[PDB]
């Protein structure tokens, strides 16, 4: 039947439109089960039926696009090419017969997507009929057909695989003429949206931006026209242009900047439009600030634009009671100001805003004084280096606004003070502790105005948070006595009515003071502990949920500061509070508030208790695992489906290309990260104590190495890998291999794919640390082959990026601030080279000589770092990599000496102390582990090392570690290869270079050799008649510089046995001691008592 299934289709379509959920959750299910192969000629006919309801045709056309955007490989293939080429030409007819521009836009969204899936097969599009449709429609003198063609080209820009060779210059013709179509303004607006979509699609193509530069003047005119007609469709296009491809705007940047300034400045347009115009400029200050820095004339005019939006405040009747949680011009301008001060810098921005803030602070408008203090708070981050100098003047002036006749201004002043305490730390704390603490305490007390009193407490938390413990301790008795007073009075008020806004902040403020005060808080423990314990038993209501969590945080931070001993007095009564509040927080299953407060409070109890925490592990691990495993809700919607989910606010969407989009529920993403970081804490603190949880935590963490939604989670997952192996170690190597098996492949894939550099460096360090955990036999041949390719690629990229950054310099818009970014990029690339050297070090240390054939693939790249014209960090790290080959892969290391030995010998004399140290080290391990093949080179190296050691300034803070390493290398030459040196002659000089105390490893080595020399059958080192024995007392006296580790090392006992044996020779002992300074004399006593 053909006529029977068409009449019943209209009622089913309207059924899934009724306002009640009864038939709504019954008519949608019947629709989906229908075969998709038949849904084509059934649903397109409901749009063609123009005599049917206009709201049913809106739904039929929206439903037809979704079946093409989501499903395609099951519906279109294997269907007859009679009905294949019939849905192509019938869809084209609907657009020609459409009178309503609403439906014309819905059916054009179906013309594209169909065009998109056919074209996206191989490259060449299987629908040349869709292409002819646009050239003939844009050329047809019909406005509707012209508009339909521009909509298909906006939706799917680039319906061609061979556009470049010929159809490219005709696209310019089409849009240039459409932007000149004065007779109609919507056709001009549609081609501006198309021009932008086309330029965005053709990203990276710098030859195409240069060719289409001629479209930017007409494009800017199209935003200037559309905006005054309530259309922020073309303005969004420009913001997208400035964000993704700002260099396209370079030819007419002044015109772009002037227009964006005009739209924003024009009071007449709506808030959404003016804010978007500001956003063009703000985005350019992040994306292309080097270009924007040249148009100072425009950035100067933008400053009062943001300031005028910041003074667009509503006089909220009953502000002092309610809670303010942000779309307004006052928030938009303020945020834009922060972002632009950060983007362009304080050198250019502070001079432009300085006099404007003084005109707003010194004004009777209140809205102006409030805007002034919020502008001061905003510019702080980006201009703080330039704001110091006037800082004492700024602070003393801002402190007067706390006594302002307007409570909202007293609140913005609180914000200014609190934000400066963060932006200018710790200089702020050292300079204004007396004035700021005193003024904030007074605002927290003599206000009788909840919001201002709460904000002053919040500013005080910011102040104490970044305050050095050093200068907080004198203010303890005063601040503590004042905080206790406010806590006890605001606790009575919680009981009278239910006011808690200030009390929440007082509690957190106490916690901040306690945490910073550490051990110095114990004399004030009894003054708050029973008051806070009383609060967590009181605050059980859903209104007080935050007040209870903040009190638990305060309680756990107080016990953590005083330490396990002082806390043991009220520990039992307080651990039961947490046990009871865990079942109270869990019996009302939710997410977001008390979760992170509880997780962190239990973890603080584990640091306090240590090995006694074990009993609480099943009660804390269960809930911790649940929030650490939250799978966030991800959606793959299309078109403008970010309007119905805008009310959520936390549901963030990243608009992907080709109309599709990606959405993610940000709820609990920070809770997941907190929990993952907590699991890392439990693993580290407990070690052996965590074995029961190691397998399930390992199973949880491995997939989180690929959790690209939150960097903090990935870092926690990466950090936990060696720590979990460290825990599991207690069960033996068979369980260790079972754990390492889950990790290995995933850790290696992560290194090869990781986007972020700092997250990559944790994964790379983590992988190296796991290799150390049980090296040799810990790697598959597939893994070695994969790792080889990954490290070789990472090395290839290191040098490639060196050339790229050079090409970034030698660009029209190159300045000192772009050089600062290139140097940051270089610093990151170097830190990745250190982690390449780290992964390499652990493979060498564990596999030894065996792995040199594998390493030959990286050999040309490692040699490439040790080249003479490379930057010093390359030569430093390449030498470090060869030092691990000499130390861990000798004597086979010598086959490869033609790659490192001669440059390493030469480099001992390098201008860079980091290079000198790496070279000196290699020569020391050459004598110790190298073997007989290096013997001639040990005889040769000696005067090179002694020339560095003996030169002046060898012991500068800059060159100590290099000189010490040279001293220790000379030492290793003496001890391990004494046929290559006349040890009997260099020993007096060697002795004079002692002691070592900066390089702790080399201090151990040198001292261990000195002990062999003193303990030897015929010392030589003592001097005839023990003449230089008192000098050995001065060397051993350091000592003072923590060189020889008092208990830990065997040489510590050895050195004290060599010294205490002297005590039995009266005159010799007193001679050696009488010529030691009283500081040195105590260092000998200190050693003798502990070794």
């Amino acid at each position: 039947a053909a006529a029977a299934e068409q009449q019943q289709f209209y009622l089913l379509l309207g059924n899934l439109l009724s306002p009640d959920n009864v038939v709504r959750k019954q008519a949608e299910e019947t629709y989906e089960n229908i075969p998709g192969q038949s849904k084509i000629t059934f649903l397109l006919q409901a749009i063609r039926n123009t005599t049917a309801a206009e709201e049913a045709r809106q739904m039929a056309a929206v439903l037809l696009r979704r079946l093409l955007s989501s499903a395609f490989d099951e519906v279109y293939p294997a269907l007859p090419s009679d009905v294949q080429t019939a849905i192509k030409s019938e869809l084209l007819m609907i657009i020609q017969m459409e009178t309503q521009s609403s439906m014309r836009k819905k059916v054009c969204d179906i013309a594209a997507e169909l065009a998109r899936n056919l074209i996206d097969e191989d490259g060449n599009n299987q629908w040349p009929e869709g292409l002819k449709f646009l050239f003939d429609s844009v050329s047809s003198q019909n406005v509707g057909l012209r508009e339909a063609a521009l909509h298909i080209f906006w939706n799917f820009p680039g319906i061609f695989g061979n556009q470049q060779q010929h159809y490219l210059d005709v696209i310019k013709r089409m849009l240039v003429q459409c932007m000149q179509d004065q007779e109609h303004p919507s056709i001009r607006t549609l081609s501006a949206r198309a021009t932008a979509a086309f330029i965005l699609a053709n990203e990276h193509n710098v030859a195409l931006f240069k060719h289409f530069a001629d479209l930017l003047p007409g494009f800017l005119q199209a935003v200037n026209d559309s905006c005054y007609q309530n259309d922020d469709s073309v303005l969004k296009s420009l913001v997208e242009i400035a964000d993704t491809v700002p260099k396209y705007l370079r030819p007419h940047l002044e015109a772009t900047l002037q227009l964006s300034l005009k739209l924003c400045g024009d009071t007449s347009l709506n808030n959404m439009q003016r804010q978007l115009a500001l956003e063009v400029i703000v985005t350019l200050s992040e994306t292309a600030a080097a270009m924007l820095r040249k148009h100072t004339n425009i950035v100067a005019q933008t400053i009062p634009q943001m300031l005028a939006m910041m003074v667009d405040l509503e006089e909220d009747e009953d502000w002092a009671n309610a809670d303010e949680l942000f779309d307004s011009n006052a928030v938009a301008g303020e945020s834009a100001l922060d972002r632009m001060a950060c983007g362009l810098g304080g050198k250019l921005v502070l001079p432009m805003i300085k006099e404007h803030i003084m005109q707003m602070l010194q004004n009777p408008d209140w809205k102006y004084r409030h805007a002034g203090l919020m502008a001061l708070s905003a510019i702080g981050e980006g201009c703080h280096q330039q704001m110091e100098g006037i800082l004492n003047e700024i602070v003393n002036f801002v402190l007067l606004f706390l006594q302002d006749p307007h409570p909202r201004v007293r609140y913005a002043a609180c914000n200014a003070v609190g934000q400066m305490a963060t932006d200018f730390a710790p200089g702020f704390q050292k300079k204004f502790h007396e004035k700021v603490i005193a003024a904030l305490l007074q605002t927290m007390e003599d206000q009788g105005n909840q919001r201002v009193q709460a904000h002053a407490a919040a500013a005080l938390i910011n102040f104490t948070e970044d305050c050095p413990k050093s200068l907080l301790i004198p203010y303890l008795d005063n601040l503590v006595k004042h905080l206790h007073s406010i806590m006890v009075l605001k606790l009575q008020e919680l009981i009278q009515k239910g006011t808690k806004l200030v009390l929440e902040q007082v509690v957190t403020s106490i916690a901040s003071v306690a945490d910073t005060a550490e051990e110095k808080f114990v004399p004030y423990y009894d003054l708050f502990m029973p008051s806070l314990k009383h609060i967590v038993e009181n605050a059980v209501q859903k209104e007080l949920r935050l007040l209870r969590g903040k009190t638990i945080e305060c309680i756990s931070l107080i016990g953590l500061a005083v330490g396990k001993e002082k806390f043991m007095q009220d520990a039992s009564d307080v651990m039961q509070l947490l046990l009871k509040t865990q079942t109270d927080f869990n019996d009302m299953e939710d997410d977001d508030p008390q979760i992170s407060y509880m997780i962190s409070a239990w973890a603080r109890m584990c640091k306090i208790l240590g090995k006694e925490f074990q009993q609480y592990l099943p009660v804390v691990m269960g809930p911790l695992m649940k929030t650490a495993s939250i799978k966030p809700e991800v959606a793959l919607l299309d078109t403008q489906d970010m309007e119905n989910m805008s009310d959520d606010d936390g549901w963030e969407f990243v608009n992907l290309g080709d109309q599709q989009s990606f959405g993610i529920k940000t709820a609990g993403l920070e809770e997941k990260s907190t929990a993952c970081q907590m699991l890392v804490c439990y693993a580290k603190e407990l070690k052996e104590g965590f074995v029961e949880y190691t397998e399930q935590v390992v199973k949880l963490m491995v997939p989180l190495l690929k959790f690209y939604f939150h960097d903090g989670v990935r870092v926690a997952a990466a950090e936990s890998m060696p720590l979990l192996l460290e825990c599991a170690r207690v069960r033996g190597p068979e369980y260790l291999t079972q754990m390492w098996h889950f990790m290995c492949d995933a850790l290696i894939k992560a290194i090869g794919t990781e986007p972020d550099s700092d997250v990559l460096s944790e994964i790379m360090h983590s992988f190296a640390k796991c290799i150390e955990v049980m090296g040799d036999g810990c790697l598959n041949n597939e893994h070695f082959e994969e790792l080889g390719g990954i490290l070789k690629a990472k090395l290839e990229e290191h040098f490639k990026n060196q050339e790229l950054r050079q090409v970034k310099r030698q660009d029209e818009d190159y300045d000192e601030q772009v050089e600062e970014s290139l140097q940051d990029e270089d610093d990151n690339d170097v830190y990745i080279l250190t982690k390449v050297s780290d992964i390499l070090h652990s493979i060498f240390s564990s596999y030894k000589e065996k792995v040199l054939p594998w390493f030959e693939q990286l050999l040309p790249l490692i040699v490439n770092l040790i080249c003479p014209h490379r930057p010093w960090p390359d030569r430093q790290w390449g030498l470090c990599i060869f030092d691990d080959v000499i130390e861990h892969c000798s004597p086979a290391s010598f086959k490869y000496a033609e790659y490192f030995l001669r440059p390493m010998l030469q480099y001992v004399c390098d201008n860079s102390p980091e290079v000198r140290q790496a070279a000196a080290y290699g020569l020391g391990v050459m004598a110790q582990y190298g073997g007989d093949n290096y013997r001639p080179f040990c005889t040769e190296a000696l005067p090179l090392l002694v020339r560095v050691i003996q030169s002046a300034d060898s012991k500068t803070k800059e060159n100590v570690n290099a000189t010490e390493n040279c001293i220790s290398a000379v030492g290793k030459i003496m001890k391990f290869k004494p046929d290559c040196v006349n040890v009997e002659e260099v020993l007096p000089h060697w002795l004079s270079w002692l002691p070592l105390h900066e390089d702790k490893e080399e201090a151990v080595q040198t001292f261990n050799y000195l002990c062999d020399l003193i303990e030897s059958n015929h010392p030589i080192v003592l001097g005839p008649n023990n003449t230089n024995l008192p000098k050995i007392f001065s060397i051993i006296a350091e000592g003072e510089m923590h060189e020889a580790i008092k208990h830990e090392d065997p040489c510590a006992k050895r050195l004290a046995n060599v010294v205490r044996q002297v005590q039995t020779s009266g005159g010799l002992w007193t001679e050696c001691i009488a010529q030691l300074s009283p500081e040195q004399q105590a260092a000998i006593q200190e050693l003798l008592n502990s070794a």
């Binding site: 250190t834 430093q876 030498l879 470090c880 030092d883 140290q917 790496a918 080290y921 390493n965």
Partner: peptide, 4 residues
Amino acid sequence: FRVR
């Protein structure tokens, strides 16, 4: 961190 320091190094060589």
